[PDB]
């Protein structure tokens, strides 16, 4: 598929697609690079995450627009407009699930198993939690609890390694905690745990800022501000 292009060319192209805001192309170039079978560097894992986060973020935003329409069509006094809204929300939903499944497949074949350093292992497990969480945002049936639990288990393993192996200010640790806190708040119906996790994470990071260079400080304070934005919204 991208099988005949050199890994470095795929990487170069993914960077060009990002510059061009062509995130679907970016994701396909990164998928091809992962499929070459070599581990990803830090910068390459970032590219992979950015590409898919943008693709799925477009699909999730569209799904929410369509979901909200579909719900309004189901309220008392609404005209029957036929199956179209449901069908089209399903179409977008199916495409979004396919993207989640593609990323989860890349993580399982074979990113996670070959990731030995904390920074790589936690990064990929956070991705695993994030894409199960996007599956949970749309899940409505028999498997919903198991999808939620898959997101939980992945975030939890990433939390456990990050706590042991990374400083409290590490951006990956902070972003992981931010997302696991969102998972608690809006997926697992645990707003208390979400608040507690965002607070503890923010405070432990504040206390370690003194160890950092100016650039590291800026990196960490940026995600800390996201934790604060959520705490402000939720309290």
């Amino acid at each position: 598929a991208m099988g005949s292009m050199e890994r470095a060319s795929l990487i170069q192209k993914a960077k060009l697609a990002e510059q061009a805001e062509r995130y679907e192309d970016m994701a396909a170039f990164m998928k091809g690079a992962v499929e070459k079978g070599e581990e990803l560097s830090v910068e390459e894992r970032n590219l992979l995450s950015v590409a898919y986060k943008n693709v799925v973020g477009g699909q999730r935003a569209a799904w929410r627009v369509l979901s909200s329409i579909e719900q309004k069509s189901n309220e008392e006094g609404s005209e029957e407009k036929g199956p179209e809204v449901r069908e089209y929300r399903e179409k977008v939903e199916t495409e979004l699930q396919g993207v989640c499944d593609t990323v989860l497949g890349l993580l399982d074949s074979h990113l996670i198993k070959e990731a030995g350093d904390a920074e790589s292992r936690v990064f990929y497990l956070k991705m695993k939690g994030d894409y199960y969480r996007y599956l949970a945002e749309v899940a409505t049936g028999d498997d919903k609890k198991r999808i939620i639990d898959s997101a939980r288990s992945a975030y939890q393993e990433a939390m456990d390694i990050s706590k042991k192996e990374m400083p409290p200010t590490h951006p990956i640790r902070l972003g992981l905690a931010l997302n696991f806190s969102v998972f608690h708040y809006e997926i697992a119906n645990s707003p208390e745990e979400a608040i507690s996790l965002a607070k503890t994470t923010f405070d432990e990071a504040m206390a370690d800022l003194h160890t950092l260079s100016e650039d590291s400080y800026k990196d960490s304070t940026l995600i800390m501000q996201l934790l604060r934005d959520n705490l402000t919204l939720w309290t």
């Binding site: 994030d130 972003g175 931010l178 997302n179 809006e186 996201l226 934790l227 934005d229 959520n230 919204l233």
Partner: peptide, 6 residues
Amino acid sequence: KRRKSV
């Protein structure tokens, strides 16, 4: 204002 994720 939508909650933040990263």
